[PDB]
Amino acid sequence: MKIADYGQLGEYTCDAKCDAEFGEPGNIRHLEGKTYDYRGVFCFNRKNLQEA
Amino acid sequence: MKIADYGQLGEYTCDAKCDAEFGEPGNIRHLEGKTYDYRGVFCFNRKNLQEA
Amino acid sequence: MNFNVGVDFPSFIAWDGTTSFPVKIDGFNQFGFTFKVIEELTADVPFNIFYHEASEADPCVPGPAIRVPDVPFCDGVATADGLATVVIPEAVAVDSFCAGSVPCFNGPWISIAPVTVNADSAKVQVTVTMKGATR
Amino acid sequence: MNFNVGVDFPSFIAWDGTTSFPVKIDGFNQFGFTFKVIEELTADVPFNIFYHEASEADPCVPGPAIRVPDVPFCDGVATADGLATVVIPEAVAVDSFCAGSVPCFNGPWISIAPVTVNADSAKVQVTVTMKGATR
Amino acid sequence: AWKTAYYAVEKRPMFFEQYEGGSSAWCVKYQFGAEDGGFVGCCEHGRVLRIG
Amino acid sequence: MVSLDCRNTCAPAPASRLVQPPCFVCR
């Protein structure tokens, strides 16, 4: 998950009143990735490989 | 032993196929050395050597 | 199995029959000569063994020829004049080879040539074999 | 200390630049070639490898030359005609040497000679070395 | 400020297997491979300099 | 088919390739 941005929330308000108002929302997104592979081959001769 | 050269083995391959290809080999070789000697002589007289 | 010996024990021509070739023994730590005949001889053929120093004007070229000195063995005597020499006897057949080497290294290059350039010397072949390298 | 390496690893000329010499490998159980260049090359020089067999007239004289066959390894493909060849590249310096050997023995005699005899071929020398003996 | 500008991910270490499809009683063939990947993180945590 | 092995040279560099150093940066 990737956080695109936080919103702007809250405010300084006078203490004399009893209500509060809405802010605005943020954005959060979802991401994916994949994996690659490395490959190869090699050969030998049994007699030489064993008797070296 | 001296490792003259490593080879080049493998490569990044697509995951959709079932085979792989040969690389190329390296090169490893054989070395030797020998040793030298330092030599000399010196002389003394027993009476002077013992009475000193 | 076949081992490809030439990697570890290189061999070089030294006396093909009509010319002498300096051989650089500097890069290796042991060596030895090998003699072979190609036609019947008529008299003993002697050979002279030299060594060469680096050329003054160019360090990568051999200098003049200098005769190799003799080192008496632990129990023997020196030669007539203290210089190393070799003789190939008469009994050597065509299907045979002779081997021998000097006890000391001296200069970095080595060489060999017959005392005379008569028809007999042209019937012999000489080469130098090297033992494991050091570079 | 220096050794008499020629006793164990004898060397024989094979191509002195003007002539080839059959080399008897029957008494030994490994061998390999060694190439040296004495002058700057003008073009690639390929070499042919042959082997002989004991003649009927004399059981100690080689017969005619039979060209060595190829032997593919576990990787790579066979030659266009399935016959061994050797190529000395253009980049070989005068102060260097090469080494190579055949995978299979075949007859008791071997030889090597250039495909074409030209001024470029005269600038090369080939020698053969032997491993331990069997007799 | 790497460790946040770019990430590196690995999945499995190298593995070696013998191949019976071409492994006679007098020869061998070996197979190997590995997997990994990577993905850029924050684009704002790095800069590049160039000539102009 | 034969694979040749060759040494770089008998000497490491019979004529050592001594080379000038990189020119100094501008003022």
Write structural notes for this entry.
Chain E: It comes from Agrobacterium phage 7-7-1. Chain E: This is Major capsid protein. The structure is cut from a larger assembly and holds three copies of chain A (52 residues), two copies of chain C (135 residues) and one copy of chain F (27 residues). With 52 residues, chain A is mainly beta. In chain A, 12% of the residues lie in helices and 31% in strands. In chain A, strands 1-2 form a two-stranded antiparallel sheet. Chain C is an all-beta fold. Helices cover 0% and strands 38% of the residues of chain C. Chain F is largely without helices or strands. The N and C termini of chain F lie far apart (59 Å). Chains D and F meet through strand 6 and strand 7 of D and strand 1 of F. Strand 3 of chain A pairs antiparallel with strand 2 of chain B, so a sheet runs across the interface.
Q: What are the SSEs and their pairings?
A:
The structure is cut from a larger assembly and holds three copies of chain A (52 residues), two copies of chain C (135 residues) and one copy of chain F (27 residues).
Chain A: E1 2-5, E2 27-29, E3 36-44, H1 46-51
Antiparallel strand pairs in A: 1-2
Chain C: E1 11-15, E2 23-24, E3 31-37, E4 45-54, E5 62-67, E6 85-88, E7 97-100, E8 109-114, E9 124-130
Chain F: E1 5-6
PDB class: viral protein
Keywords: Flagella phage, Agrobacterium sp. H13-3, Capsid, viral protein
Entry title: Agrobacterium phage 7-7-1 capsid
Give the fraction of residues assigned to helices of chain A.
10-25%
Helical residue percent band of chain F:
under 10%
Shape of chain A: rod-shaped
Structural class of chain A: mainly beta
PDB class: viral protein
Keywords: Flagella phage, Agrobacterium sp. H13-3
Entry title: Agrobacterium phage 7-7-1 capsid
Chains A, B, E: Major capsid protein
How would you summarize what this structure contains?
It is classed as viral protein. Chain C is mainly beta and 135 residues long. Strand 3 of chain A pairs antiparallel with strand 2 of chain B, so a sheet runs across the interface.
